[PDB]
């Protein structure tokens, strides 16, 4: 029945069967998601296909390249602690911040799982006057050499022409030695479980601002459930404390998305990423 001496609802039992209803009758209503929503949601494997903006490269110069790791995009970005100092009264106020970053639909799902398997999709938005954008992957480490080449002759090349297609869409395959790879940082050094890959986005002519939006490729799959990640309230984006030189938003963020307003928060003074050892 609903109560007893044996465990009435353990994990292994909850996955398969529900306890008796309080009504002692059928408690279930029929699925009508397709009848109101107009669409049906059942699996996060499909929802990760949705592409949202993930990072932005601003603080370099007028370069013709931007190299960065791919697995770092499956992670949710690091949350930072921002020190603000009042230009007048000189007391410190403290908030949170995403340094030129933000999570994706993909990152909400990937942070519940341990390993991944499949290709990552990267779409780029550039500034005006850019004619081309080129994408190439390279192994980040010529194993056994202290240095990696600056060119390659057999790597993939993919050219998109901005003034006729404004978003440069690329798909980066899954190239790793193992069945399913790892995407979070570790100190393992004996041999590796991640497929360590670079991705070089070029612009002709060279430009400064690169806006990246990431999403799941068709073959995207995560493996082992581990649990819900550390989160921050979305309402904390609009809460602010006012000081002399401007506003201090609890959740400070940059123009990572080339289509979002720039929030009117003053720049911080120091940034510190929350470490796993900082949790109390």
């Amino acid at each position: 029945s609903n109560s007893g001496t044996e465990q009435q609802n353990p994990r292994g039992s909850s996955l398969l069967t529900d306890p008796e209803s309080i009504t002692k009758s059928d408690p279930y209503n029929p699925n009508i998601s397709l009848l109101i929503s107009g669409e049906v949601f059942t699996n996060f494997r499909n929802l990760i296909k949705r592409v949202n903006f993930r990072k932005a490269t601003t603080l370099n110069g007028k370069r013709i390249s931007d190299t960065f790791d791919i697995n770092s995009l499956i992670e949710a970005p690091r949350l930072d602690i921002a020190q603000y100092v009042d230009t007048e009264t000189k007391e410190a106020k403290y908030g949170f911040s995403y340094f030129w970053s933000a999570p994706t639909t993909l990152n909400i799902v990937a942070e519940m799982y341990a390993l991944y398997r499949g290709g990552v999709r990267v779409k780029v938005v550039t500034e005006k006057g850019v004619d081309f954008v080129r994408a190439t992957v390279s192994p980040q480490q010529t194993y056994g050499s202290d240095v990696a080449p600056t060119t390659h002759i057999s790597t993939p090349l993919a050219i998109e022409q901005i003034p006729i297609k404004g978003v440069a869409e690329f798909q980066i395959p899954y190239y790793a030695p193992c069945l399913s790879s790892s995407f979070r940082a570790n100190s393992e050094t004996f041999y590796y479980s991640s497929g360590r890959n670079n991705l070089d986005i070029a612009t002709s002519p060279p430009s400064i601002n690169r806006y990246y939006a990431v999403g799941a490729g068709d073959d995207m799959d995560f493996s082992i459930f581990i649990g819900t990640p550390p989160c921050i309230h979305a309402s904390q984006t609009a809460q602010f404390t006012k000081i002399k030189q401007g506003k201090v938003y609890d959740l400070r963020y940059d123009q990572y998305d080339p289509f979002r307003e720039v929030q009117d928060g003053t720049a911080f003074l120091n940034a510190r990423s929350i470490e796993d050892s900082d949790l109390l």
Binding site: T5, E6, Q7, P10, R11, A114, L115, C178, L179, S180, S181, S182, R184, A185, N186, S187, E188, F190, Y191, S193, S223, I224, F225, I226, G227, T228, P229, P230, D276, L279
Partner: protein, 231 residues
């Protein structure tokens, strides 16, 4: 095939005798002797030294092995550990019964079984949780946040025990890795970290004692190896 016309050397395909692992391939002559017409004594005459059973190396791994044998008082509250954490399988295969057997094997792919006993006289209360975080060396960023609090461990793969109801508890942890197996010669990539939290504190002064057993099932042993690394 490059064709070869040999008439001065015999294709001595015998004088080639593999004995389990080692292959001898010999020239000249192979000789073998001993006392001839060998018999054996029937089993009544000996066999007072053996059991009516054989033990392979797969059992010896299916045997439960005591890991912990301790207690925890009423001073430890919810969300705090009552037992030390266990690395799977490092804190298991390091006991001599297993380690002496796994030696000479490259790797191990098997599901591990952690069983825990609990001692209660019927006047004691409390509940206790036993969970397992997969691959703790590959995602060290997330370990201590998924194991410092009940309700972040129990949504993981866990097993609870009502102190006044369950006297034994056993969680089955299947093998899971980016790889095929668990490297034994380098002990690389443990596939879970068993942690033990307190779902609810004790209500009396009398502590509770517990024994933690660990064994393996679904055992696939690797290739034979010397198993020694430089240092």
């Amino acid at each position: 095939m490059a064709e070869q016309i040999n008439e001065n050397y015999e294709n001595k395909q015998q004088l080639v005798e593999q004995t389990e692992i080692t292959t001898f391939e010999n020239d000249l002559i192979v000789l073998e002797d001993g006392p001839q017409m060998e018999e054996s004594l029937p089993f009544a005459f000996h066999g007072q030294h053996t059991d009516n059973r054989q033990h392979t190396v797969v059992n010896f791994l299916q045997r439960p092995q005591v890991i912990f044998d301790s207690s925890w008082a009423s001073d430890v509250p919810r969300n705090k550990q009552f037992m030390d954490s266990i690395m799977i399988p490092d804190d298991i295969i390091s006991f001599p019964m297993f380690a002496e057997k796994l030696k000479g094997f490259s790797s191990l792919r098997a599901t591990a079984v952690i069983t825990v006993q609990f001692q209660t006289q019927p006047f004691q209360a409390g509940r206790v949780m036993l969970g397992s975080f997969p691959l703790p060396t590959l995602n060290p960023t997330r370990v201590k946040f998924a194991t410092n609090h009940v309700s972040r461990l129990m949504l993981l793969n866990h097993v609870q025990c009502d102190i006044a109801k369950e006297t034994e508890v056993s969680l089955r942890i299947p093998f899971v890795s980016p790889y095929n197996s668990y490297d034994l010669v380098s002990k690389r990539f443990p596939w879970a970290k068993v942690v033990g939290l307190v779902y609810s504190p004790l209500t009396t002064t009398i502590p509770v004692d517990f024994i933690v057993y660990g064994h393996f099932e679904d055992v696939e042993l690797g290739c034979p190896t010397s198993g020694m690394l430089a240092q």
